[PDB]
Each structure stands twice: as structure tokens, then as C-alpha cells.
Design a protein around this ligand. Structure first.
Ligand code: 4NP
Length: 159
């Protein structure tokens, strides 16, 4: 697991055993934005809702927002993501399956709006702790679309 900003927002792939989830809890995680797709989760645990139940079990408030592999959040989802992340600062963990593409994208989209950084730079930061962060033209297109509305993106959020 990795921290982008120490204890405010970090990420990882999809855990396989409970311990790994207590690894999060121990490294400082408090909340969790689950990014995998239903089937992606269950192929690992056997039951999506069961996984979300243990997430809540260890406290961690789980917000499940599905994002297909190599894809990007939908305008609504994203705003729904920020409202979530930008409303608890401490302990955020964004995870998908590999914790490289979809997670890298979301973290970067966070930095872009929080630290007002351009894409290639936000990416550069995330790849600093998460090597190879962001893997599809789709995601790059998004981040760009984001950076081009860091204005409304925030007005939308902090409304
Ligand atoms: O190995 N995999 O099956 C796999 C690896 C990475 C994936 O996507 P990510 O979590 O956005 O990096 C999705 C699936």
C-alpha cells in the first residue's frame, strides 16, 4: 500500500486477505473508496457485499463506486468521489484492483484540484510512490478534462 500525501490520501490494489485490510487500518487508513467492479471484487472474495461488509467491519467507511478496468469515473461519480474525499482529509485510501491505473487516475485528479498541478506533473508525483501510475489514453483524456474545469470542479464541490 502507498501514501501519496502522508495520511491524507493514498492507494493500493485490491487486498486478498483480511490482514491486508488491517494493514491499512494500521498504516492509518480510516475511510475507503472502493473502485473495482462487482465481478472484480467477487472473483477475489466470492462476494462483493461481503467484502464491503468487512470493510465496514474494521470501521472503515466504504464507498463503492464502480469504474471498469482502464476506464474513468463519470462526471457524476467523480463529483460524488470528491464530495467524499474532500470531506474527511485524513485517512483516505483509494483502491481498485491493481492499484495503478484507475487509482492512479483518481489520486492525480485529486492533486490536480487540490494542489492545482498540471497532469504530467500530478502524474509525476503519483508515479513517485506508485510507479507506472495511469495506463490508458482514456484516463489521460479525463485528467485533462478535469484540469480544464478545476474552476467549476471546485465550485461544484464546495457549493
Ligand atoms: O491484474 N489484474 O487483473 C488487474 C490489474 C490492474 C487493474 O487496474 P487498476 O487497479 O486500475 O490498475 C485491473 C486488473
Amino acid at each position: 500500500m502507498y501514501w501519496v500525501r502522508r495520511k491524507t490520501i493514498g492507494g493500493s490494489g485490491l487486498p486478498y486477505t483480511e490482514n491486508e485490510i488491517l494493514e491499512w487500518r494500521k498504516e492509518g487508513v480510516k475511510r475507503v473508496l472502493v473502485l473495482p467492479e462487482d465481478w472484480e471484487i467477487e472473483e477475489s472474495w466470492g462476494d462483493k457485499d461481503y467484502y464491503l461488509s468487512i470493510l465496514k467491519k474494521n470501521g472503515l467507511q466504504p464507498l463503492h463506486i464502480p469504474i471498469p478496468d482502464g476506464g474513468v469515473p463519470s462526471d457524476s461519480q467523480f463529483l460524488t468521489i470528491m464530495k467524499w474525499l474532500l470531506s474527511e482529509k485524513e485517512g483516505n485510501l483509494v483502491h481498485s484492483v491493481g492499484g495503478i491505473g484507475r487509482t492512479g487516475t483518481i489520486l492525480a485528479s485529486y492533486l490536480i484540484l487540490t494542489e492545482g498541478l498540471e497532469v504530467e506533473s500530478a502524474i509525476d508525483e503519483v508515479r513517485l510512490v506508485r510507479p507506472g501510475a495511469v495506463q490508458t489514453y482514456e484516463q489521460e483524456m479525463f485528467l485533462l478534462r478535469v484540469e480544464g474545469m478545476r474552476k467549476s470542479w471546485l465550485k461544484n464541490i464546495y457549493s
